[PDB]
Design an enzyme around this catalytic site. Structure first.
Site, PDB file in Angstrom:
ATOM      1  N   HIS A  41      24.510  15.335 -23.555  1.00  0.00           N
ATOM      2  CA  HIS A  41      24.002  15.799 -24.879  1.00  0.00           C
ATOM      3  C   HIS A  41      22.587  15.291 -25.129  1.00  0.00           C
ATOM      4  O   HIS A  41      21.941  15.913 -25.949  1.00  0.00           O
ATOM      5  CB  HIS A  41      24.945  15.535 -26.152  1.00  0.00           C
ATOM      6  CG  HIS A  41      25.335  14.113 -26.575  1.00  0.00           C
ATOM      7  ND1 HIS A  41      26.615  13.882 -27.052  1.00  0.00           N
ATOM      8  CD2 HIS A  41      24.643  12.969 -26.863  1.00  0.00           C
ATOM      9  CE1 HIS A  41      26.738  12.634 -27.459  1.00  0.00           C
ATOM     10  NE2 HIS A  41      25.554  12.039 -27.373  1.00  0.00           N
ATOM     11  N   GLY A 143      23.408   8.373 -34.024  1.00  0.00           N
ATOM     12  CA  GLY A 143      22.815   7.724 -32.886  1.00  0.00           C
ATOM     13  C   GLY A 143      23.782   6.920 -32.037  1.00  0.00           C
ATOM     14  O   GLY A 143      23.349   6.256 -31.101  1.00  0.00           O
ATOM     15  N   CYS A 145      26.242   7.940 -30.057  1.00  0.00           N
ATOM     16  CA  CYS A 145      26.666   8.500 -28.801  1.00  0.00           C
ATOM     17  C   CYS A 145      26.175   7.652 -27.649  1.00  0.00           C
ATOM     18  O   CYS A 145      25.064   7.122 -27.667  1.00  0.00           O
ATOM     19  CB  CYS A 145      26.150   9.895 -28.642  1.00  0.00           C
ATOM     20  SG  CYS A 145      26.920  11.054 -29.860  1.00  0.00           S
TER      21      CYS A 145
END
EC number: 3.4.19.12
Lengths: 306, 306
Positions: A41, A143, A145
């Site tokens: 991602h 943030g 991830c």
């Protein structure tokens, strides 16, 4: 006399967290030896994650577009590969604080610690179980991830989870460190159900043994029953079935308390059909299923590991 | 959408733990700069802690009787002093991994993280509040004395607790890092009550705001009330009184949710007199009081510290 939800010491994992930026858009990575692992991602903005073709998006990004910063210092990226849903970034510097480590894929009912990290800096540590529907119920904000979940066997770290997604229902999904999602989820923003979140029976039983090891046992009845008898009450309340493997695994706890596994099942059956009626067990008003039998063994004689 | 009990990252504290042995009898110490701090109980065997005169027991122990081992390596003790209930051992080596740190004395209702350690090796990390009766409800088994509790302000560690005692009732007592017990307790094995363990009202309210920030708010009523009106219901259920300071401290949470502090008090009053009736709030069947308002701020927008 006391039995806390508690996580593994996180120091060995703190030393591995870095910040990864692509399209000045930022998240966490895991630096072990000369490889940084992060969610693929990272290469997406929006739309992209509304309809991402990751192979085509990765085509004309390059090594220099991946900005990896650790501590306050910049890592040189000298290659990259996509494996399933993770990107591997080869850097030209080994992490000199790499711990002993393994990559495991775990199993619903398994517990692990999460080090929740924000743009490369760790901010909190806590425990969860992998739910039987392949979600976890975490605390992940923007943030986050790329934060990871881990176990330890005294010295060596077992990395088992990397955070990728928050579903619309508010629960969390992610991958192992080979990039394979737990359960059916994909790294895209469309529609994807979590199924039934059943209670992890063997973990509840372990926690009841913990409660006895500390003397909070009004709930000890005397009834016994059978596996089949107990499981017929288990479906009712969407508890996972109990089998012999799980009976076997509870063996050390039955040995020490003197309470036969099926007798403890009989107390649990009575609790499920009667409800605490205002009482607590070990500070909880409900039945906790985020302790494995081995978790309890790490505390249930308060003697962890050698 | 999710809000976990979670502890501070512990790496900075792991690097400070050592093993301290006196009379080959062992417990944990904290190594900062060239001083090791540990419970003065190290010089006791039994009887001793049944009736300990610490000044007279310390007379003919000496520097060389204090065996300090860190990692796998032996520290040289070059002096020692007793300050209140802690012993300070001067060593001839600075801990080269000493973090920025301060010594605080905290206040009932305050939360902190405990790194539970066994003969110098950390085994688990978790959160607690200091209870209003000056106990904590920890998880401390044999050899755990000298484990510490800490907060962090991004970089610098606030050491606030050292573990010394388990009372007969199963709850835990200890000191600040100047060696002064929290509350009335002494480091001896006679008789010593913990008083009423009241619920920390301002923390419950903060947690209710957290629950709203994540959408689990069936319990939002509409009633309002006054401080005095609410406190009259508070005594009933042995909740701590609420005052203006605590209203002031909840200000940012009221600002963001749009829910006036006294309106949230009115939901809490209704919950205390009605009981969940089988419902949960944020995965809990009871009202949690181990989150401060600033704890919630570290999560309640999931943006910790800078």
């Amino acid at each position: 006399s006391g039995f806390r939800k508690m996580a593994f010491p996180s120091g060995k994992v703190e030393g591995c967290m870095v910040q990864v930026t692509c399209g000045t858009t930022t998240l966490n990575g895991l630096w072990l030896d000369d490889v940084v692992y992060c969610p693929r991602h990272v290469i997406c903005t929006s739309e992209d994650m509304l309809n991402p073709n990751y192979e085509d998006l990765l085509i004309r990004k390059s090594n220099h577009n991946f900005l990896v910063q650790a501590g306050n210092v910049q890592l040189r990226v000298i290659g990259h590969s996509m494996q399933n849903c993770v990107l591997k970034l080869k850097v030209d510097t080994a992490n000199p604080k790499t711990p002993k480590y393994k990559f495991v894929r775990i199993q619903p009912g398994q517990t692990f610690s999460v080090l929740a990290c924000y743009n490369g800096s760790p901010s909190g540590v806590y425990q969860c179980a992998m739910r039987p529907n392949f979600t976890i119920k975490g605390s992940f904000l923007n943030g986050s991830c790329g934060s990871v979940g881990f176990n330890i066997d005294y010295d060596c770290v077992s990395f088992c989870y990397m955070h990728h997604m928050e579903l619309p229902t508010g629960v969390h999904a992610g991958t192992d460190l080979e990039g394979n999602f737990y359960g059916p989820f994909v790294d895209r923003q469309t529609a994807q159900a979590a199924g039934t979140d059943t209670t992890i029976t063997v973990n509840v039983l372990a926690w009841l043994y913990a409660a006895v090891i500390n003397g909070d046992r009004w709930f000890l009845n005397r009834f016994t029953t059978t596996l089949n008898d107990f499981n017929l009450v288990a479906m009712k309340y969407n508890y996972e079935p109990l089998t012999q493997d799980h009976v076997d695994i509870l063996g050390p706890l039955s040995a020490q308390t003197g309470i036969a596994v099926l007798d403890m099942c009989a107390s649990l059956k009575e609790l499920l059909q009667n409800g605490m009626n205002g009482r607590t067990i070990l500070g909880s008003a409900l039945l906790e299923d985020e302790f494995t039998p081995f978790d309890v063994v790490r505390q249930c004689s308060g003697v962890t590991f050698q």
